[PDB]
């Protein structure tokens, strides 16, 4: 009975306060829930070579925009820094690339082979341009610090490694062997110690 007077409904609130509250509520309830799927088309248009042989280049095959983006990210990872600074561009485009790969009642064998071929082609579009080395370089530069950088890099690695991709596994193993990178395994270990578990104190509090 006294609750409605201890705290008033929306009609008692001033116009501007209610307007701000409605803006926040509309944002949270609608804008995130509205979802559009553009990753496949984006990563395919970026993969398309834009008529390079028609263009008056008279030279070797120029690198596609997706390859240039992957090279930019790889160079940023390889650059020596005291800390792996967060890059909004990376956390956006790595998510886009991972979505493009994983792209997700009984299925026939021909159909299942079809989704396998689709996944292989989508993983090829990325690990034919250096994504396998990129996802290792970012983890190595992380130096065992948990963050959104690793949270997106691991997702991209899983997306490109779905189904146990032998070509991608071989590419990562060869890259690690030829670079003799200890930082990758050091960062993996550090992430393992930084991983969290259940906390009775926090649960009780």
């Amino acid at each position: 009975v006294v609750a409605c007077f201890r705290m008033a409904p929306l009609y008692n609130l001033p116009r501007h306060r209610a307007v701000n509250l409605f803006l926040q509520g509309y944002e949270k309830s609608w804008i995130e829930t509205e979802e559009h799927y553009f990753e496949d088309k984006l990563i395919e248009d970026l993969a398309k070579p834009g008529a390079e042989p028609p263009e008056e280049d008279e030279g070797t095959k120029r690198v596609d925009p997706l390859h240039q983006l992957i090279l930019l990210f790889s160079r940023t990872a390889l650059t020596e820094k005291c800390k792996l600074e967060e890059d909004f561009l990376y956390m956006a485009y790595a998510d886009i690339m991972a979505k493009s790969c994983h792209d997700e009642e009984v299925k026939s064998f021909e159909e299942k082979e079809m989704e396998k071929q689709k996944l292989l082609y989508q993983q090829a579009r990325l690990h034919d341009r250096g994504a396998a080395e990129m996802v290792l370089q970012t983890i190595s530069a992380s130096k065992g610090e948990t963050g959104p950088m690793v949270a997106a890099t691991l997702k991209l690695g899983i997306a490109i490694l779905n189904g146990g991709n032998s070509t991608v596994q071989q590419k990562m193993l060869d890259y690690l062997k030829e670079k003799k990178d200890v930082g990758f395994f050091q960062s993996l270990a550090g992430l393992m110690q930084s991983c969290s578990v259940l906390d009775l104190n926090a649960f009780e509090r």
Binding site: L10, H16, G25, L46, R62, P65, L72, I96
Partner: protein, 407 residues
């Protein structure tokens, strides 16, 4: 500014000196406050709409009626003879209309001259011809002096086909150097920011009537509940649970008529209003053979540049891909702008603008090394902010402005 036989290095130095002396401080202040939206509740604000006319075609970015509070222009006299610190404050005065006319004439001439690919660019190179000139144009446009027909003409110069009101090629397809492309990307990002500001203002305008009708029906429901309270005491508790839930919860529950669960006690017409406004907003954002829109134009231009040439400069690649992601993730602009969107009453406009000026001073003096006069400025600005009634009345605005982080 105008001599065509000036050496390129001196031309760049002079276009830098002009910006630094006269038209840099206000540009910096407005650029810092560009990501914050305080929209007063005025009749001009209510008049704002997503689409200018009945057909759903985007208007030219920039032009229109914008009511968002922005930093105020005040320029000190160029007379430095007086030793007063009050007159030493602010930026020296300049004929900012002669400057804006000359810049437009200049870029108009440069578009025609460089298109023929002459062997004698102003300053000796296309970079010296374009990078400092476009940068002066970019600073003027950021400062916002360009308005209406001047912006229309400069948009025609940037791209005639896309911005045509309804064999000439705009700056976007001119085989531009990398430094020129970086400045063009900056201009395109500013245009996108203007579109996002227009979207936020239209959302605030729609809120004015939508929230009013929501409050009216929510109070009629309360009156019906309280008059039927005597009929059943058991039903009274579950009827009044909404009325005793916190106002944020009330907004959240009344705004669930999305999908088909329909748990909200929202009238059908109130549901239809937002169901139409949200569709119109998504159409404006592009979520749901020429490009005809800035978003499609940028999405074509960035990919065309990347396919055409291997961009050597990492910053150009970064800017191009950031802009492309902005075009392809328009909902992201909303999810990042709305949490920084605040609404104030008309009476509080003067106090809000004074508080914003004080905050602008406090935030802009972050970039200078600490000193005694800066200590006095910090203390005085903090005192003014404390004295402002807005600081007390609107803690949410204070938190969204990131003021505690600045201190």
């Amino acid at each position: 500014i105008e001599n065509k036989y000036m050496p390129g290095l001196l031309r760049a130095g002079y276009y830098d000196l002009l910006i630094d002396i006269h038209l840099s401080s206000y540009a910096t202040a407005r650029l810092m406050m560009n990501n914050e939206y305080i929209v007063p509740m005025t009749e001009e604000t209510k008049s704002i709409t997503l689409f200018p006319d009945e057909n759903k075609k985007h208007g030219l970015p920039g032009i229109g009626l914008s009511t968002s509070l922005r930093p105020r222009m005040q320029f000190s006299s160029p007379s430095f003879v007086s030793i007063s610190n009050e007159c030493y404050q602010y930026s020296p005065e300049f004929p900012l209309d002669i400057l804006k006319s000359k810049t437009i004439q200049m870029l108009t001439e440069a578009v025609k001259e460089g298109s023929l690919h002459a062997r004698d660019p102003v300053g000796g190179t296309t970079e010296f011809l374009f990078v400092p000139l476009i940068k002066l144009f970019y600073t003027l446009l950021i400062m916002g002096i360009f308005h209406n027909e001047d912006l229309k003409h400069i948009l025609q110069l940037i791209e005639p086909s896309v911005f045509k009101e309804a064999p000439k090629e705009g700056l976007l397809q001119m085989k531009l150097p990398e430094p020129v492309k970086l400045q063009m990307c900056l201009l395109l990002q500013y245009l996108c920011d203007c579109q996002v500001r227009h979207r936020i203002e239209a959302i605030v305008a729609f809120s004015d009537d939508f929230v009013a009708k929501l409050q009216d029906n929510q109070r009629f429901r309360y009156n019906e509940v309280m008059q039927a309270l005597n009929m059943s005491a058991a039903l009274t508790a579950r009827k009044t649970k909404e009325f005793r839930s916190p106002p944020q919860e009330q907004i959240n529950m009344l705004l669930n008529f999305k999908d088909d669960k329909s748990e909200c006690p929202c009238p059908e017409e109130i549901r239809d209003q937002l169901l139409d406004f949200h569709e119109d907003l998504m159409t404006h954002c592009g979520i749901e053979k020429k490009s005809s829109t800035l978003q499609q134009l940028i999405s074509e231009t960035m990919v065309r540049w990347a396919q055409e040439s291997v961009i050597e400069d990492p910053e150009l690649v970064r800017a191009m891909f950031v802009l492309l992601h902005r075009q392809y993730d328009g909902i992201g602009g909303l999810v990042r702008a709305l949490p920084k969107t605040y609404t104030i009453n008309g009476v509080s406009v003067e106090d809000t603008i004074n508080l914003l000026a004080s905050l602008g001073q406090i935030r802009s003096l972050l970039s200078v090394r600490m000193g005694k006069e800066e200590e006095k400025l910090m203390i005085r600005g903090l005192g003014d902010i404390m004295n402002n009634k807005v600081f007390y009345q609107h803690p949410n605005l204070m938190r969204a402005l990131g003021m505690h982080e600045t201190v």
